[PDB]
Design an enzyme around this catalytic site. Sequence first.
Site, short mmCIF file in Angstrom:
data_model
loop_
_atom_site.label_atom_id
_atom_site.label_comp_id
_atom_site.label_asym_id
_atom_site.label_seq_id
_atom_site.Cartn_x
_atom_site.Cartn_y
_atom_site.Cartn_z
N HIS A 198 -7.46 -5.95 -0.28
CA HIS A 198 -6.26 -5.20 0.05
C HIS A 198 -5.77 -5.54 1.45
CE1 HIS A 198 -3.54 -1.79 -0.48
NE2 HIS A 198 -3.97 -1.23 0.64
N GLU A 254 -8.97 -6.31 -4.51
CA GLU A 254 -8.39 -5.20 -3.73
C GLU A 254 -9.47 -4.31 -3.13
OE1 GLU A 254 -5.26 -4.15 -2.96
OE2 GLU A 254 -3.99 -5.46 -4.18
N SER A 305 0.87 -1.20 0.00
CA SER A 305 0.00 0.00 0.00
C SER A 305 0.90 1.24 0.00
CB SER A 305 -0.97 -0.11 1.17
OG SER A 305 -2.11 0.71 0.96
#
Length: 567
Positions: free
Chosen positions: A468, A348, A215
Amino acid sequence: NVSLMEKLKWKIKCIENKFLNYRLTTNETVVAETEYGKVKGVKRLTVYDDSYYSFEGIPYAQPPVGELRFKAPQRPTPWDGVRDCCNHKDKSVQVDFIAGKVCGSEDCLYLSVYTNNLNPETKRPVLVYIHGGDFIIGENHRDMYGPDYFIKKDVVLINIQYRLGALGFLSLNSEDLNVPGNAGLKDQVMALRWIKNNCANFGGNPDNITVFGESAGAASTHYMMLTEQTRGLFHRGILMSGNAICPWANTQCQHRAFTLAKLAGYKGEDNDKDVLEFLMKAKPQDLIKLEEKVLTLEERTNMVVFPFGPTVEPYQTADCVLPKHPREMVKTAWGNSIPTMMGNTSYEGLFFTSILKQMPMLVKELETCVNFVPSELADAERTAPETLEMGAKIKKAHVTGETPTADNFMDLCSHIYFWFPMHRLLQLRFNHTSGTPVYLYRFDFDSEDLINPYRIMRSGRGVKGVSHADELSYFFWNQLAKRMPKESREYKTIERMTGIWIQFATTGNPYSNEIEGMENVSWDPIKKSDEVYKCLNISDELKMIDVPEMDKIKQWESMFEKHRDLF
């Protein structure tokens, strides 16, 4: 927002984890050398009865307090005697992602070093993890980033901290003030220099350093691959769900210091010197608490994500990290010429589950999708027929039924924030590399038997799909983890994920026939001539596949057919 039920569950887990960590502490301590003085670490166990030497709280910079607030990091002061590194230091000032209160300290410029053997038989690959958290949260504490899985193998693992939020990313135009921006990225630079100069004292190979992150940590790793400040400091990079040309990964925040100062009680006018003088005297908790109010109505309208973050610096300084937009920096970047691995999870956008539960009208943005058109393509009003036509292309890609759904929205999010910037980066980089390989993975392993605290954030209990940050459970021990049976699919996935990362760190090639299930894999890097990307899909099996997202990726790309110079 997290429910009071989960907040109490988390409090219980924190306490049980504290006592587990006592039981995992041994009485064996060890002294290691650093360029600034000796450090004392401690031998720890894992729940799998592996063991490792733990050094936490190693300073790589002076505490950025007083006159040093908002400034580039300065080299630490050497010491005599032995510095105690048997416990962690505090995290950077931030809003706690569960409690919702400000926590941490300005005294946060530390890194942690872990290895199962301080005097190994051969110098070891060094893996450096840069945590994510949107440049506003995160830490190197082992309740979220435990080295317990990596130290099964003969590597040195290093977890860094760096300044967050306005304390890490204030930026002022006035050159006299020496606050150009990106202090938190300059922290990462100084940590990487420390690692280069010191990893050999812990058994590490300074000629074989890998930087990886997820990230905002992936954007950070990419920034460290782009900047001249770090040229030649490391040798492989892994970008996990992000990169530096993601729309969320940078912003021009030079005007926002005045706004933050006003929110904190400033009574003066908008000039940098008076604004900085006020912010230098503010309590850091106050600044970080007010950050959430800093974006103006106009900035929210233009879909600016965060008020402070990586920025193109307005003037040059000795420590300047970002002298140009990252897209331009790719054209000359030293890191284009090191082996690179990139990837994403298979859903995600499931990360925005709870936001969509809170604001279900967000699904109405899919009616025309004009607000998802890249800003460099859209007219300012987002009413031009050409903008509407590009919105219609996004809509075709993601709206699968008669009525747009929350799942459609989350699928779109996967692409706008992760897959499309990946694609744009790969294609840009091919123009500015000399054949160095890039490998793609896709993390597609779903389980709720082994989780990490990100699942609580997205209110993801009982939600199927690989969101994610779900892969972090297979790289790092954390306080919600449990010992998994050796024969379990989760255990095998830990072995595979850490195994592939270590293999790539070692050789620049992520394939090894020693990794269970990898034997029949032919994992080629992406070629410039490829029209469809191939990736290693990690599920219960390891398989090379055409990237399933490719068709949607091409639909996003088609928006640039008449604007190819912007792609």
